[PDB]
Amino acid sequence: TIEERVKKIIGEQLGVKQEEVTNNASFVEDLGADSLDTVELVMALEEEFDTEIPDEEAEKITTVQAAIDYINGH
Amino acid sequence: TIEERVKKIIGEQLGVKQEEVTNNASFVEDLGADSLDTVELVMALEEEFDTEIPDEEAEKITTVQAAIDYINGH
Amino acid sequence: SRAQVLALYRAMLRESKRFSAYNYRTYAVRRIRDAFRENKNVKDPVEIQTLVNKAKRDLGVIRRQVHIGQLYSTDKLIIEN
Amino acid sequence: SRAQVLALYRAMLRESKRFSAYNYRTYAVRRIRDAFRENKNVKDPVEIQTLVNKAKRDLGVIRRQVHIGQLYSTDKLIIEN
Amino acid sequence: LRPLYMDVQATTPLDPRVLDAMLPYLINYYGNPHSRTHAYGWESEAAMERARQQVASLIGADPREIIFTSGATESNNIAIKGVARFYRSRKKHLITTQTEHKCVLDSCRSLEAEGFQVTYLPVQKSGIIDLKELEAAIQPDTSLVSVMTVNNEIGVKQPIAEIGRICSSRKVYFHTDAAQAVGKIPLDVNDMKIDLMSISGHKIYGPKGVGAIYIRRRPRVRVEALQSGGGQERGMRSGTVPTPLVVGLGAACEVAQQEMEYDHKRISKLSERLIQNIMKSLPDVVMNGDPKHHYPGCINLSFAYVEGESLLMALKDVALSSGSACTSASLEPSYVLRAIGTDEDLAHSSIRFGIGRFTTEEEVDYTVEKCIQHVKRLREMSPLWEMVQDGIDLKSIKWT
Amino acid sequence: LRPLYMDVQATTPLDPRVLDAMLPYLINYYGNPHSRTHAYGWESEAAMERARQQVASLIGADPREIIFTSGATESNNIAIKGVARFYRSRKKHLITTQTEHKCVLDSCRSLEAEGFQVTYLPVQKSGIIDLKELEAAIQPDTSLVSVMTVNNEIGVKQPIAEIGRICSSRKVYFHTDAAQAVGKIPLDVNDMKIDLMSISGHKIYGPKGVGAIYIRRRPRVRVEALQSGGGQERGMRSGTVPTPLVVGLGAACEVAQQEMEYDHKRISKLSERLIQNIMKSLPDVVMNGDPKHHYPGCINLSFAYVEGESLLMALKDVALSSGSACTSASLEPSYVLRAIGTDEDLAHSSIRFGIGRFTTEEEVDYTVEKCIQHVKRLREMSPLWEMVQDGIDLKSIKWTQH
Amino acid sequence: DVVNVVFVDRSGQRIPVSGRVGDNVLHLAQRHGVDLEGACEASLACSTCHVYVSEDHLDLLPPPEEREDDMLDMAPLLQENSRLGCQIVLTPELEGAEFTLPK
Amino acid sequence: YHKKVVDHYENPRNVGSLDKTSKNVGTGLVGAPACGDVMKLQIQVDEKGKIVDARFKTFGCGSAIASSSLATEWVKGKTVEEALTIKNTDIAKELCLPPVKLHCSMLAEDAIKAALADYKLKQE
Amino acid sequence: YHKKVVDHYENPRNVGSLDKTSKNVGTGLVGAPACGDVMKLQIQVDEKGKIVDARFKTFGCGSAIASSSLATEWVKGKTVEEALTIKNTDIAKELCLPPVKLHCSMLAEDAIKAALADYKLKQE
Ligand SMILES: *P(=O)(O)OCC(C)(C)[C@@H](O)C(=O)NCCC(=O)NCCSC(=O)CCCCCCCCCCC
Ligand SMILES: *P(=O)(O)OCC(C)(C)[C@@H](O)C(=O)NCCC(=O)NCCSC(=O)CCCCCCCCCCC
Numbered sequence A, B: 001t002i003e004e005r006v007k008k009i010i011g012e013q014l015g016v017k018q019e020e021v022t023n024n025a026s027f028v029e030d031l032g033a034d035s036l037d038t039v040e041l042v043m044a045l046e047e048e049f050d051t052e053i054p055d056e057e058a059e060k061i062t063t064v065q066a067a068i069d070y071i072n073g074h
Numbered sequence C, D: 001s002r003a004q005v006l007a008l009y010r011a012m013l014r015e016s017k018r019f020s021a022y023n024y025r026t027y028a029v030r031r032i033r034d035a036f037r038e039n040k041n042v043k044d045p046v047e048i049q050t051l052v053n054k055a056k057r058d059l060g061v062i063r064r065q066v067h068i069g070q071l072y073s074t075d076k077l078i079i080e081n
Numbered sequence E: 001l002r003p004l005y006m007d008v009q010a011t012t013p014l015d016p017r018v019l020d021a022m023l024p025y026l027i028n029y030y031g032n033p034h035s036r037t038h039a040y041g042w043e044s045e046a047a048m049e050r051a052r053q054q055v056a057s058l059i060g061a062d063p064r065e066i067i068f069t070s071g072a073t074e075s076n077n078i079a080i081k082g083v084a085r086f087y088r089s090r091k092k093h094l095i096t097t098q099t100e101h102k103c104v105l106d107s108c109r110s111l112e113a114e115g116f117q118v119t120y121l122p123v124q125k126s127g128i129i130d131l132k133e134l135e136a137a138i139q140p141d142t143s144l145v146s147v148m149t150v151n152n153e154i155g156v157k158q159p160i161a162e163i164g165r166i167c168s169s170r171k172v173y174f175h176t177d178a179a180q181a182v183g184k185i186p187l188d189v190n191d192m193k194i195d196l197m198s199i200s201g202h203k204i205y206g207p208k209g210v211g212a213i214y215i216r217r218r219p220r221v222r223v224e225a226l227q228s229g230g231g232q233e234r235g236m237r238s239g240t241v242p243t244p245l246v247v248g249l250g251a252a253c254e255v256a257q258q259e260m261e262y263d264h265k266r267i268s269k270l271s272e273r274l275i276q277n278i279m280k281s282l283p284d285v286v287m288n289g290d291p292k293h294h295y296p297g298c299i300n301l302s303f304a305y306v307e308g309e310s311l312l313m314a315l316k317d318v319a320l321s322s323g324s325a326c327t328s329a330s331l332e333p334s335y336v337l338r339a340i341g342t343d344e345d346l347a348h349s350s351i352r353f354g355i356g357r358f359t360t361e362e363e364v365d366y367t368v369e370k371c372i373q374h375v376k377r378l379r380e381m382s383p384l385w386e387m388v389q390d391g392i393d394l395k396s397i398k399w400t
Numbered sequence F: 001l002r003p004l005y006m007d008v009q010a011t012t013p014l015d016p017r018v019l020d021a022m023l024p025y026l027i028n029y030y031g032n033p034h035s036r037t038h039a040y041g042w043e044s045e046a047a048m049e050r051a052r053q054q055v056a057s058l059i060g061a062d063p064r065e066i067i068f069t070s071g072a073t074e075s076n077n078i079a080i081k082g083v084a085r086f087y088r089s090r091k092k093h094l095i096t097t098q099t100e101h102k103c104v105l106d107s108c109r110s111l112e113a114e115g116f117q118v119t120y121l122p123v124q125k126s127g128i129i130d131l132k133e134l135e136a137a138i139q140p141d142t143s144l145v146s147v148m149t150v151n152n153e154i155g156v157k158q159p160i161a162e163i164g165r166i167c168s169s170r171k172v173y174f175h176t177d178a179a180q181a182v183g184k185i186p187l188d189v190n191d192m193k194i195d196l197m198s199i200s201g202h203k204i205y206g207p208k209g210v211g212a213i214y215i216r217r218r219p220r221v222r223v224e225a226l227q228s229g230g231g232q233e234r235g236m237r238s239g240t241v242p243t244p245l246v247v248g249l250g251a252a253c254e255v256a257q258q259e260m261e262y263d264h265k266r267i268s269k270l271s272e273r274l275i276q277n278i279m280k281s282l283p284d285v286v287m288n289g290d291p292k293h294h295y296p297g298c299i300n301l302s303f304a305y306v307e308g309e310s311l312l313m314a315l316k317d318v319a320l321s322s323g324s325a326c327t328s329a330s331l332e333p334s335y336v337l338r339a340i341g342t343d344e345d346l347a348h349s350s351i352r353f354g355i356g357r358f359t360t361e362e363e364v365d366y367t368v369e370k371c372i373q374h375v376k377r378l379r380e381m382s383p384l385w386e387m388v389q390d391g392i393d394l395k396s397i398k399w400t401q402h
Numbered sequence G: 001d002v003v004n005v006v007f008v009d010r011s012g013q014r015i016p017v018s019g020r021v022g023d024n025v026l027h028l029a030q031r032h033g034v035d036l037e038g039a040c041e042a043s044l045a046c047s048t049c050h051v052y053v054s055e056d057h058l059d060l061l062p063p064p065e066e067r068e069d070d071m072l073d074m075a076p077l078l079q080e081n082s083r084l085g086c087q088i089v090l091t092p093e094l095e096g097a098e099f100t101l102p103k
Numbered sequence H, I: 001y002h003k004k005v006v007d008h009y010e011n012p013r014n015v016g017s018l019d020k021t022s023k024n025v026g027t028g029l030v031g032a033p034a035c036g037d038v039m040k041l042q043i044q045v046d047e048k049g050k051i052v053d054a055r056f057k058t059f060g061c062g063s064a065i066a067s068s069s070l071a072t073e074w075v076k077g078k079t080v081e082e083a084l085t086i087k088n089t090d091i092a093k094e095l096c097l098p099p100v101k102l103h104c105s106m107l108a109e110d111a112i113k114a115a116l117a118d119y120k121l122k123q124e
């Protein structure tokens, strides 16, 4: 399940305890994460799902919904 | 001039005194060259002109005329 | 600043994750993360530029050593299983 | 096995000319040519196979050393001008 | 599948930065540093002089005070034998500790065979010498005092600054073996009043087969050279200086000077983790050496009623070391654990854990789990454990 | 643009095969060879034993007779000092040559302050010792005889086999410094009756800071250890064995055994090339050393009326060496040239040329051309040349100053 | 203000010489012919004023200067009681001192 | 470490104890001469002169554990006279023990002999 | 490899000889080949009493050739009394000669003095 795997990756990367993660929570505003956190979250996404994410789409990935849409589309 | 340069390369490689190379002289019989000298001649041809010769086309290069035709064609 | 530093961080992490050795991969990843953590609140642009230069040189060293370790590789450790 | 030996000779010559250092490049090319010419008349297939395996190991060594010398390269010699 | 490395006291892995500094001199700059007529020698000499400055910067000293050697063994030999032979006409007494390294102890034994008088200072049950015993051991004809900074077996730190103050008050040269302390704890030869110091390359994540010795120039300490030849290294160590090795030594010293405070914090946290996790799950486990003056990277634990080499054999996926007399080639017991007053039963049960720069929490937890399970197994196997659990005291039992 | 390297006697470049062999132990196999309980120590020890076997195979000895050191300086120190000190209760006399390397000479002079008697054998104008003098210099209390195989300054070869047969007849231990001969000329310890041999890693395209000494076991030769410690290397050299360095030394010895016949032939043809082209174009050029008993790789030439250091300064594009006092930090003239009866005028004019495995014909030709033109330029600048061309005699000419 | 010292030449001859406080040991030799060269003449640049001081009186001398130690390092036949004659000044503590000239 | 030593540790054969109060059990407990090696070897005898069980417990090195395990294996199935013949030479030849390791085999033989003497003393 | 020393070596300025058989030419020749540095410094004093030309030929190390060239440059176009004012210290300072190579500067000073003395013993 892509939804569960993405949520698990985000929770493991950001310490959100798997319950503060939702389909409308931002990485920085809602969850406690900085840009350095965001870079390794995106790198962990690229590690789990084999995909060379371009920089443009990487900066477009700012929320859990955006990450889920990207992974489901690719 | 390609015509002069190819013959000159063969002259350096096989030590022909620049007189023995003709448009119909073979590498093995007419000139002193075993397979080891022909490999070294093909590499020298690939160096003077920055054109890489496929192995199948390298096998076809047995005389001066074959090398001349290959270089003029490419 | 932000953009260049973020890109350098990403490149350094990418290159360090390619270490063949477990001793070298984990230490490099952990050290990069801790250093970018400790230098988050620097304000002097000269100090920032010096840090970026140091990170660039360390990135070069990491690239060379990672490739050399890929040339001379060995068996994984018992904990990587 | 003539084609195999010729292909190995060609590969060894191509890889040796990529040596960054002048001394290593010249020595490798000259040594490969001399070694292949000195064994031109070997008849025993076992000895031929032993020489082929030795040349394969030498080719691997040459590849690794050529690349690592490309990673750490210096200025050319005065004679190369 | 290779095992984990937890034996950093024996030797350390090469730092990739040190290897990246070494390789250009192993590929392109191969000239002799003593060749004065061409650019090859000029650049090799420049690299050597930079390496010397890096080592001096690390130990807080002048570059002219640094002499490159082939290791801490030769550095200790130079220090001890050279000082003793140079100051022979007036000073014929030496002072060292019973817990010193074998190179120092063997140099002292050889000098004793050479007609010198050597006093071996006992230590307390904590591994630390008695400063009062040091002051009472100094004679008007005492030449040298040698105390190591960090012990390679139990990891206890000696009062180096106090010892150096005492030696400078009594006008006695003070040598310290810092092969386990350089790049790990702060060192300043001037604040500590050190006259001679030994440095090892492969204890600081540098190359093997290279070392250095510090010799003080104000006030000038003089040694008698042991290696004869063409007067390299100011005439104190003859023979060609290995340029890649000294460059690696300088790179390692610079990297250590930059990384020391982070490494110490990380290693201390990991050492607390290991010690606490081992103690909370295994009864009758004792740490060898005093924790108050202890370097956290060397951990020595005795597992009662379990033999050290049997435990090491059980821990086949972890590389470790033991003070057991059965791991020695000559069946030699641990003289350090005899000096610190450990019973022989618990001295055969000692395991040395090494936490270094590249050690991970994963490795530490894996080692702790494996140790717990295998110690439980060997204790269920052990007759000493049987008798102790069956209400019997080991001392009262007759042994043949 | 870097200069050409023609100074192989000072040190050699690392062979790429040697570096290829060393690299795995600088990255993955970093264990201590003396670690008895884990796999890192076991693999390091296996590599060390393999390298020891390689060195023994190169010199035709048993592996148990090989002890790793930090270089040929340490090997010479161990040999001379340990042999002298172990047998000093009955043996108080040593024999060596005046053309030996400074490590041997300095060890002998440091033994003279310890109460030993040392005889320094003179050499002939060829640079070869006279065997009758060696036989006449041996005493009933003689301990050791030390003669180097190949001279590092002029490249002459001593009759090692005859010296070994004389020493065995007289029951005297024989040591030879082979740091310039290992991997270059054939060596066999049993056929030459050699009791001790010194080996240098970086003279045979191996890593710096590593060496070896051969100590014969039957009949047993015993030395007094100089480095105290944990009893490593059969108790003869304490300290941790540098596994990458000894692995590189063994790889160097294996490559040298395979490549010595080709290297020697092509180095001989290059040396013949160089000497013939310099001689035919420059008058008053003299080779130092007997051409008969000479190793082609080490060429020492004197260019009359041109000082050595100025010629070296002219050849800023070629890395070379000289034997001039002006190149020495202490203004020390070459004692090897003085010992072979070279007059002081030509001692300051000497240049050493080095030809190795990695030397090309193009380098030799370039060096010869530059040397010819710069010697001509310096001779046109020299007052000695001016007086000689004038018909004047420099020897009769008294010197207005010193 | 008279201090008596003993000079031992290169061939083991004790030459009793009488000097006064404030004199230079090196210059106290040539006046009485003890053959010390002192080429640099107290410039601390030649180290030919080398001399061996007696063990008892060596500790009384002031610490050698850094340039004096730099010269002493090169000095042949260096010993633990080696000093430079140009830098030794006679004092009442130095009564009975013996100066030995190195070979 | 040798294959047989590693196998003899990794696979326990007779690690345990036997009731000392039982009359048909002989217990040996000996110690190495210059190291911390301790072996407990116990043998059991049925109604006839046959050894039906033997258990060991060893505080010592891996080679000592292996020596005691081989000793209990060889002791099991024999009689007292057939077990008095077992020597440290045979144990060392089975385990391929290096010269520094002969103390374990000698200690195992001593444990065997002590257990047999103990059996005789209690059966008296 | 000082910039000033090799400057005079690759571009030596007054290399040559002069007529020893001349009334207005002084010839100096000092040093010995056994020592390793020999210099021949020649001057030509005009009718006005001011050096107009100078030539040198030096057998020796590169610092010696640089010192000889600098000496020929400095003593040209000056009075003999002004030429005597040149010391080896000035040449060493200009060429940055290390202490080991001061023999070159002293030898050049002696060569200048010898040429001046030859003029002072020939002009009469
Ligand atoms: P994000 O929160 O939007 O942005 C985070 C950053 C840090 C970019 C932001 O807070 C910022 O702009 N901070 C200002 C200061 C700054 O830019 N800090 C970082 C400067 S670059 C730096 O810190 C270099 C660190 C070098 C690490 C070397 C690692 C060596 C490893 C060797 C392995 C062998
Ligand atoms: P051509 O006339 O067609 O002849 C082609 C050949 C030689 C293949 C043919 O004549 C033939 O079949 N000959 C029989 C013998 C033979 O083929 N021998 C070759 C064996 S392989 C060989 O020569 C190995 C050479 C190894 C060189 C190693 C160099 C290492 C360098 C290390 C440092 C860089």
Ligand code: FES
Pocket: G026, G038, G039, G040, G041, G042, G043, G044, G045, G046, G047, G048, G049, G071, G084, G085, G086, G087
């Ligand atoms: S005279 Fe030269 S140092 Fe005293």
Ligand SMILES: [Fe+2]
Pocket: E326, H035, H036, H037, H060, H061, H064, H103, H104
């Ligand atoms: Fe044991």
Ligand SMILES: [Fe+2]
Pocket: F326, I036, I037, I060, I061, I064, I103, I104
């Ligand atoms: Fe000179």
